């Protein structure tokens, strides 16, 4: 629960990317010119009013002041998109000069600043992309072990979504094996963008190849996850870390908004939108209302603010 402040760089020499500071003095860690890399930069509100006064006297950059008691990633994003009237925001830079312990945002991509040069743009969409992420084992499939397409209308809706550029990101928690069968069984991949498996579990991380099935080009479902929280509970959230990682692997570096669609609300750590799939032992053809919901969710920013 804190007041907050943000730089807005005057000359957007690099766009969209934003940073978070532990010190007003961190400018010294940044040195010359590199501030021109970061369109906006958030800092916790000054305790001493003289700091804010000197800031107010500085003309080198624009700035904003606000409250964000809501210590949440997506809520902060929403607030900032309001403040600067911008639908999209870049990645958050980090340094070995360790960030302020705003670790409530822990689960996120962190850019070690120098990768800024590594920031290629990408072809993959001519519009700014929306993204939707999915699961197999109990998400949208029929509950029969031989799953069925709930609706061929959905089957073609898959391709239709390309009209809007909605990117389609399956992460089955189930092993690669059932996906290996599913692929041959139904060319949803022929309608569908990105696939991942093995998400079921988290491993006790501590400091102490699949192509052969049919000559595929598919990912090593590597052990990229970590304990991350090391606490007495049993949650396997969908991971923006891995997700964005794969996105930048696809050179996907920006997005409008991302929705998770799954049967498990718990994994949603404040995703933009969550679609609790209605588990079904029949092809329900319920997709019509799911469509409508998602469309309205998209429209939310037609007003320039999600609400």
């Amino acid at each position: 629960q804190s007041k907050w402040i943000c730089l807005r760089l005057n000359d957007a020499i690099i766009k969209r990317h934003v940073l978070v500071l532990s010190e007003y003095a961190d400018l010294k860690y940044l040195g010359f010119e590199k501030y021109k890399f970061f369109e906006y930069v958030i800092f916790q509100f000054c305790n001493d009013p003289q700091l804010c006064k000197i800031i107010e006297n500085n003309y080198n950059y624009c700035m904003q002041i606000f409250k964000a008691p809501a210590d949440d990633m997506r809520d902060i994003r929403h607030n900032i998109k309001r403040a600067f009237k911008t639908p999209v925001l870049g990645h958050m830079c980090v340094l070995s000069n360790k960030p302020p312990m705003y670790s409530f945002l822990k689960e996120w991509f962190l850019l070690p600043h120098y990768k800024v040069v590594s920031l290629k743009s990408e072809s993959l969409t001519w519009g700014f992309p929306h993204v939707v992420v999915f699961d197999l084992d109990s998400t949208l499939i029929t509950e029969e072990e031989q799953v069925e397409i709930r609706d061929p209308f959905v089957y073609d809706s898959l391709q239709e979504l390309h009209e809007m550029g909605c990117v389609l990101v399956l992460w089955s928690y189930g092993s690669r094996d059932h996906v290996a069968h599913s692929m041959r069984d139904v060319d949803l991949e022929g309608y569908f963008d990105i696939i991942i498996s093995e998400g079921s579990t988290v491993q006790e991380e501590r400091s102490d190849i699949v192509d052969y099935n049919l000559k595929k080009r598919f990912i090593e479902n590597k052990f990229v996850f970590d304990i991350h929280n090391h606490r007495s509970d049993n949650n396997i959230p969908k991971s923006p870390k891995i997700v964005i990682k794969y996105l930048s692997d696809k050179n996907v570096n920006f997005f409008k908004s991302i929705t998770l669609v799954d049967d498990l609300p718990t994994n949603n750590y404040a995703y933009d939108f969550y679609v609790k799939v209605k588990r079904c032992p029949t092809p329900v053809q319920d997709w019509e209302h799911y469509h409508n919901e998602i469309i309205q969710n998209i429209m939310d920013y037609e007003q320039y603010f999600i609400k």
Partner: peptide, 21 residues
Amino acid sequence: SLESYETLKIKLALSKYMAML
């Protein structure tokens, strides 16, 4: 570099010495 700003600090001490003379 994480020392680069310190090299700049060395530049600063240098210039501080220089300008007086």
